[PDB]
Amino acid sequence: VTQTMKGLDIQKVAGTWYSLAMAASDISLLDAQSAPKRVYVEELKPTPEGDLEILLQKWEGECAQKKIIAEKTKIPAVFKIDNKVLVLDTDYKKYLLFCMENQSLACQCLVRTPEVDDEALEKFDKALKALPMHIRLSFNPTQLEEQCHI
Amino acid sequence: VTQTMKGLDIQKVAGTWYSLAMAASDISLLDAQSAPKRVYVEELKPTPEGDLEILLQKWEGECAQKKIIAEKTKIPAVFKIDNKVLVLDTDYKKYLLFCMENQSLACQCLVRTPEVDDEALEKFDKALKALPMHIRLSFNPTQLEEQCHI
Ligand SMILES: CCCCCCCCCC(=O)O
Ligand SMILES: CCCCCCCCCC(=O)O
């Protein structure tokens, strides 16, 4: 994965996000509701010290609320977990594209509102032309308003 | 779905095909190995009377061989089953794009050889820009040579 947000302002990505689309390099990373990289983002909480708290949801027969922290690195756009989180692109107000790397790649197109942003899905597809994705999912506005996008 | 192969020669699509990519309007149509529209095409056998026998595989804990017939209609590119099969495009020698319609849409990019044809995946993505797909899958060359793409 050869794409990062130059000049990322991590502060400016705080608050509410929607997992509108997901892609991964193996079907099994996303295929089931229980699939390991099937995580829904609720909110991004950047610490004062420039780390990133992630509020998400994960189905494990329960939609479970889950709080994790991604530690800063020397590169503004890359963070470590427990496995790396890369930020590709964000306009801060509407969309944010990110990938998680073990290679067992998974990327999402986050958006601010429970709507289908065709502009943001274009960029996300463009950012994935380069990657070896074998499963892509997207969620309708109804499903975006529910726990675990049921 | 507003795209059909004008001037389809059904005879010329006979024989060996690979289900390289799949897309559907709901995740549940493709998400599991047991998902209803998760069918792998083996061979296409057009009858003398212009019908289409489909040899496929479907996982139901067994990869099961399955023989079905799609009856001709007034339109060369549309066939009925038991639910319609539409043929979008084929160059006969390398690729064939088709959709199945109940609307619960599912489409595949079939290819002749167990290889990743980037040209055919482009056309297939172009034919799906128009459709309300929420799950896309693709299979590597190894998986194409196995029962049920395991
Ligand atoms: C910059 C936004 C990153 C979103 C982070 C999602 C990471 C989930 C990790 C996990 O699978 O437990
Ligand atoms: C023209 C090629 C069409 C392929 C047909 C695949 C239909 C499978 C129907 C079913 O789900 O049982």
Report the structure determination method. X-ray
> In CATH, what number is assigned to the domain containing residue B80?
2.40.128.20
CB < 8 Å to B135, chain A = 135-137
Answer yes or no: is B5 within a domain. no
Task: Round to whole Å and give the CA distance between B68 and B72.
Answer: 13
Tokens for B149, please give them: 């793409």
DSSP state of A65: E
How far CA A59 is from CA of A32, A106, A148, in Å, comes to: 9, 17, 7
Q: Please give the backbone phi and psi of residue A115, each rounded to the nearest 5 degrees, phi first.
A: -130, 160
**Beta strands at B78-81 and B84-90: parallel, antiparallel or unpaired:** antiparallel
- B107 in ligand 2 pocket by Cβ < 6 Å? no
Chain B residues with CB-CB distance to A under 8 A?
Answer: 27, 31-32, 133-140
Q: Where are the beta strands (DSSP E) in B25-141?
A: 40-46, 52-59, 63-72, 78-81, 84-90, 95-101, 106-111, 135-138
Instruction: Flag whether B2 is in a domain.
Output: no
Nearest to A14 by CA among A46, A39, A49: A46
Q: Would you say residue B145 lies in a domain? A: no
What SS3 state is found at B75? Answer: coil
Domain annotation covers residue A147: no
Does the Cβ of B39 fall within 6 Å of ligand 2? yes
Please answer whether residues B19 and B40 qualify as being in contact, where contact means their C-beta atoms are separated by less than 8 angstroms.
yes
Helix (H, G, I), strand (E, B) or coil at A117: coil
Residue A149 lies in a domain: no
The two three-digit tokens of residue B88, written as one number: 């979008």
CA dihedral A55, A133, A121, B137 (to 10 degrees): -100
H or E element that contains B142: helix B141-144
Which residues sit opposite B44 in a β-bridge? B15, B54
Question: Contacts of residue B139 in chain A, CB cutoff 8 Å?
Answer: 134
Do B92 and B9 touch, CB atoms closer than 8 A?
Answer: yes
Resolution, in Å, please? 2.4
Domain of B69 in residue numbering reads as 10-139
Q: How many residues does chain B have?
A: 150
Residue A108, domain member (yes or no):
yes
Evaluate whether residue B148 is within a structural domain.
no
Among A8, A59, A86, A100, the mutation site with the greatest number of ligand 1 atoms within 8 A of its Cβ is: A100
CA distance B28 to B37: 9
* Type of residue numbered B110: L
- Encoded tokens for A97: 């594209």
Q: Looking at the 3D structure of chain B, how many domains does it have?
A: 1
Tokens of A55: 């509020």
Q: Which residues make Cβ contacts (< 8 Å) with residue B127, sequence separation at least 6?
A: B3, B88, B89, B97, B107
Pick from B32, B133, B139: CB nearest A31: B32
Judge: B135–A135 Cβ closer than 8 Å, yes or no.
yes
Closest CA relative to residue B14, chosen from B50, B67, B38: B50
A1 lies in some domain: no
Q: Are the Cβ atoms of A134 and B134 closer than 8 angstroms?
A: no
d(CA B120, CA B138): 12
